[PDB]
Amino acid sequence: EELKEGIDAVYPSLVGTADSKAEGIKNYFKLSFTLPEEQKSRTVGSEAPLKDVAQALSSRARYELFTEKETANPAFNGEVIKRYKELMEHGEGIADILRSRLAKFLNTKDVGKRFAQGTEANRWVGGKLLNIVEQDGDTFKYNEQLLQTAVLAGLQWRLTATSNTAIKDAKDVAAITGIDQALLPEGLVEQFDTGMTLTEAVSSLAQKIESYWGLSRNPNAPLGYTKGIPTAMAAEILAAFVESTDVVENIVDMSEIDPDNKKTIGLYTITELDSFDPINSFPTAIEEAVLVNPTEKMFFGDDIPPVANTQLRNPAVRNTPEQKAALKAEQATEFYVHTPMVQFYETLGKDRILELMGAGTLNKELLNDNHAKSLEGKNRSVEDSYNQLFSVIEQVRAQSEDISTVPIHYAYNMTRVGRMQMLGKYNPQSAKLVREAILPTKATLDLSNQNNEDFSAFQLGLAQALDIKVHTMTREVMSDELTKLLEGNLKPAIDMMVEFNTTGSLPENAVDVLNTALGDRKSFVALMALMEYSRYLVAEDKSAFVTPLYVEADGVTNGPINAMMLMTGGLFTPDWIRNIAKGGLFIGSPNKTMNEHRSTADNNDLYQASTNALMESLGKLRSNYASNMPIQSQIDSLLSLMDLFLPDINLGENGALELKRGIAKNPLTITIYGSGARGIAGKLVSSVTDAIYERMSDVLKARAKDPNISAAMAMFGKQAASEAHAEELLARFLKDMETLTSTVPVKRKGVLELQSTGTGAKGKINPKTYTIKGEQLKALQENMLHFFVEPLRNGITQTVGESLVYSTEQLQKATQIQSVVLEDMFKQRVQEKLAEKAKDPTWKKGDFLTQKELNDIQASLNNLAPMIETGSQTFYIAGSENAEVANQVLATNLDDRMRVPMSIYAPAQAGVAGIPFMTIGTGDGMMMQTLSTMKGAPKNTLKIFDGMNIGLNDITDASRKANEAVYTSWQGNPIKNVYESYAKFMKNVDFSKLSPEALEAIGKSALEYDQRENATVDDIANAASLIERNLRNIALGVDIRHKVLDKVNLSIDQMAAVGAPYQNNGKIDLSNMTPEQQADELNKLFREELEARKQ
DNA sequence: GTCAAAAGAAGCGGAGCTTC
Ligand SMILES: Nc1nc2c(ncn2[C@@H]2O[C@H](COP(=O)(O)OP(=O)(O)OP(=O)(O)O)[C@@H](O)[C@H]2O)c(=O)[nH]1
């Protein structure tokens, strides 16, 4: 244990004694950190890191010498060297800001003088940086090595942090702001997706600084310093960046939106470099110079990414051997730049791509104020996607004379839900624009004959890209439908692309030609299709046409179908057989494809089935209130408003109701995953308001282009035939808005009752400022909930089966009950340990527990089985990062601001997280994992969770393997996996040791409403073990069903499009049988197996 | 309560209570 001397040699002049038992000033940097066994950072021991690395970055030969490599990244040329010289000089500036801030901190309130006299200011929340200072005269100064290395990390973060930030949805913004997800004002989500919160900016910064420091944490040192000192350094660098205008600080006030919300939230945005910046072509030069094993970098040629050991943001969960092999298989896949599409993007230009694929140039007075904010977010996405692709291209272009032959590899990690995800925000897997420029798919096709199987594959790839629903029709019908389109509407776009692949130029009206020809088919993959087809037409050798065009083996209602197959526990019903067929499980029909099923057997998928069930449930709700005219008129209004703006809702001339699969897509998926009805209603209202705000922009665009046009024609002219027909549509809109915002349905004793809000919408509409806010959004939501959503939920249940709902409820309850105990015991063991440390003189409050002490508490929970094992997958549902455990500030900056909460990796309440965890995990997660590791695993693909892009040459076998992987996935039993660990939890849990806050939470899940309030510990313990019993019976049932189903002749085409189903070769033939006959025969085998286990 | 990642600022004082 001579490591005390080791780090003292490196940092001898730091203020303080390197022992916690000393009485003077104690140096907590040398107590918290040690030198690593093997070198991590090349700046360790350097007198002046900024000078040393600047010298390294000054030339290619010096960079090669510093990194001890023979050859350096060829993108690091003359222009890039010039820009790094300038960024290095900027590092000197940030370092200079940091020094003046320290000086100011030492002077204010005579802290410097007090600290020199013995005051332990280095243990304050805002003074932990005094652990890295040195004595200089009658004052203090930074340790230059530590300061400059931190600045270097700050510079790398400044360059690439934005391309690594997480995408924030509406739910995320809701959690930050404290405003209900449904009631969020327009554009606010866009504001918070562009910015970084305090914790977001600091944690990413502190991660960099600490790694750049290149030291190991001391397991026996308090978290308040091990995690606190680099966080303190991060907070100061951020404050320095605010001063230099590299980062813009925005304190957003919530009382401007929701007056009784008192949150003021800091939002931080990194100033973007101009996209033509030479540094964009190689932004990881510092990272690759400082670190022996750099995180951030592109992987070219045969430089393959390492395989991550632990689950993403779950350090307690190790990736299984099978998961690691999958991650290796995907990281081995070579990606290639498709030059034609890059050239196409480049020729169109950023502006015209924004025009074509976004909203283009915004006229902020021909646009509704709320509608403009949606369009700003649509442009931001496309523009950032465009810049980020061309930053990659520029680096790729430098690797070789031909870009199309440079192999690119991508890093992957396994998430909490067992999904293989490409790291970085804008990659082929996450960005559609990038997806069409960098492909792993490629094939040499014989297209000299339009009767080749190669040309059939080519047609399938074009049709799917052009928005033809290829899984709904056979290949032959697909072929004819593609021809009609190519020779019809697309012809002028094809002609324009033919000329582009001849002269290399586009016409001035390019956006117009593409927009008119594609219409609703407009997507990036559709632009690929026009490109690849026109390239084929001009091709010199059609016998050997090289193309990255792909076919996606796409899961048909993947989530819901997986849940139905994996978690239904009862006896087989005839409805289940018909409904599961909608997802590709065909019983007693050898070689049946999804194509044949949709065209000859059943054209309704699971979304449509639930939509038709919603229609039936609406008719049953109307009967219950047949004489109640106000209620009948209220349903009529909601449906009138939806029909008016949404394509999926249609009302006939005689009042006939027609609903399309569209409105059920998102609700069906999230309902099963445990989403509440109110969240669904909010989203439905949000898509209604979106279309209304958009229509207001259309009004202004008509009013300015014709000041004589009526308000009715301006809003409904594109829909109606005459003036009076438009006026009655305007009459509908104003009527519907009034009654739906002034009256709401409330459920009293199981009976719906209408109530006045007293906040109804009325007044002359101003199409510019028109906004539906606060009480009015809540009103529409209430009507949507009781008249549309609740009927749909009943329809969803009817479709997927009550047996599945029961299972998911049991799964949710079990995992919730377990997570509450884990969270509470952890918190209590933390408080137990913090009580002990108070009786310690060397310890002080503000310091936390040591990592070793936190490992002791985590390991003490092993008997409660926090992990769920499948044999090939591991899940930790409770696992989270949260500030509730420490409940204290970790560090502040030197202005007493930027107060970073101490986040601890600890268990938390699961909520309904258990359901998507297991469904996605053992469903699509397990499928893709299998698809990467199986015997004869499809190569050169791009996996996107429930869909796989395959090269045109291998569409047949890859699709069959995919369906085989689905079948393998359906051998899983997630409920058994949950039961296995919940049973261990039930044998070791003491419910009495739980807090009354935690005890009530378990009561919510375990007991019926009437029994909660104040039940005994023995009462909730009995109910918890009842759920254990329930789990066993479900798991028993799922196991039997799977075994029984395996004995029967099956054709599986869930990953549909190509028409290549997997056959299980079950010996028991069930052909020429009705679902009713099939159910009876399957149940005969069920009880046969059930009595075999019995004895 | 879908999930795939969390997440208020700041004066006075040196923690954590407090007000916007
Ligand atoms: N867990 C989870 N997965 C999602 C969610 N949204 C999308 N996904 C998955 O992420 C994948 C993204 O697919 P993309 O190819 O990027 O396109 P898309 O998201 O389907 O966008 P659209 O085509 O407009 O519907 C999908 O295959 C989904 O399975 C979500 O909200 N939660």
Side-chain angles (χ1 to χ4, degrees), chain A residues 350-573:
Chain A
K350 195 156 83 181
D351 287 1
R352 289 197 287 179
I353 278 166
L354 287 172
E355 189 173 352
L356 181 63
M357 303 301 305
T361 327
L362 309 170
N363 201 152
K364 287 276 277 184
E365 16 209 44
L366 302 187
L367 268 52
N368 181 76
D369 291 4
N370 295 112
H371 179 232
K373 291 173 185 179
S374 306
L375 299 179
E376 281 162 26
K378 199 162 283 171
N379 278 155
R380 175 210 151 271
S381 183
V382 178
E383 190 181 46
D384 289 341
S385 195
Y386 182 93
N387 296 333
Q388 194 62 37
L389 170 70
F390 282 84
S391 294
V392 168
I393 298 307
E394 296 275 30
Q395 192 172 150
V396 176
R397 196 183 276 113
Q399 307 308 299
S400 179
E401 203 157 284
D402 197 8
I403 45 168
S404 60
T405 54
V406 180
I408 311 169
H409 292 108
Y410 289 97
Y412 281 87
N413 208 338
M414 205 70 73
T415 56
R416 289 153 147 88
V417 294
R419 276 182 174 167
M420 294 180 288
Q421 201 182 80
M422 274 188 185
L423 315 183
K425 190 154 79 168
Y426 298 114
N427 55 61
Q429 198 196 44
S430 66
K432 279 170 148 66
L433 186 149
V434 172
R435 196 177 299 167
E436 307 315 312
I438 305 168
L439 305 285
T441 55
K442 211 185 280 180
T444 306
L445 298 173
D446 200 315
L447 303 179
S448 56
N449 195 343
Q450 293 181 138
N451 298 61
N452 279 139
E453 293 288 347
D454 285 359
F455 199 82
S456 188
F458 188 60
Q459 282 184 311
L460 183 63
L462 296 170
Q464 190 186 241
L466 265 8
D467 214 15
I468 296 165
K469 289 291 167 285
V470 293
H471 79 276
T472 71
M473 62 197 74
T474 62
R475 195 81 69 87
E476 300 73 19
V477 181
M478 176 284 298
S479 186
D480 290 341
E481 285 228 330
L482 179 73
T483 296
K484 163 88 93 162
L485 208 66
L486 289 168
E487 301 304 318
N489 267 114
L490 300 173
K491 191 91 160 67
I494 298 296
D495 293 321
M496 186 198 69
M497 294 306 291
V498 157
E499 206 58 29
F500 177 78
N501 294 306
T502 307
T503 59
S505 72
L506 291 171
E508 297 281 325
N509 73 142
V511 189
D512 206 291
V513 172
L514 289 160
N515 216 310
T516 316
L518 284 161
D520 289 339
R521 304 175 184 280
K522 188 167 69 177
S523 66
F524 288 101
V525 75
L527 295 166
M528 167 81 94
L530 301 176
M531 172 61 78
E532 290 309 283
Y533 184 71
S534 72
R535 275 186 69 241
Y536 151 77
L537 290 171
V538 298
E540 309 270 54
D541 194 10
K542 281 166 171 57
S543 173
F545 188 66
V546 185
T547 178
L549 189 82
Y550 54 80
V551 168
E552 179 177 29
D554 204 357
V556 187
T557 58
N558 185 83
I561 293 299
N562 281 317
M564 281 173 70
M565 253 306 282
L566 285 165
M567 291 175 198
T568 307
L571 288 173
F572 292 92
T573 72

Side-chain angles (χ1 to χ4, degrees), chain A residues 196 258 432:
Chain A
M196 297 169 89
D258 197 14
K432 279 170 148 66

Side-chain angles (χ1 to χ4, degrees), chain A residues 169 417 419 429-432 435 552 554 665-666 673 920 924 944-947:
Chain A
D169 58 29
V417 294
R419 276 182 174 167
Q429 198 196 44
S430 66
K432 279 170 148 66
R435 196 177 299 167
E552 179 177 29
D554 204 357
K665 209 214 169 196
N666 177 259
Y673 288 158
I920 297 157
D924 63 70
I944 317 166
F945 319 126
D946 58 12

Side-chain angles (χ1 to χ4, degrees), chain A residues 150-169:
Chain A
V151 175
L152 279 160
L155 287 175
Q156 190 54 66
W157 176 89
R158 188 262 170 267
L159 293 173
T160 51
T162 314
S163 70
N164 302 143
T165 45
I167 310 165
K168 297 196 196 76
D169 58 29

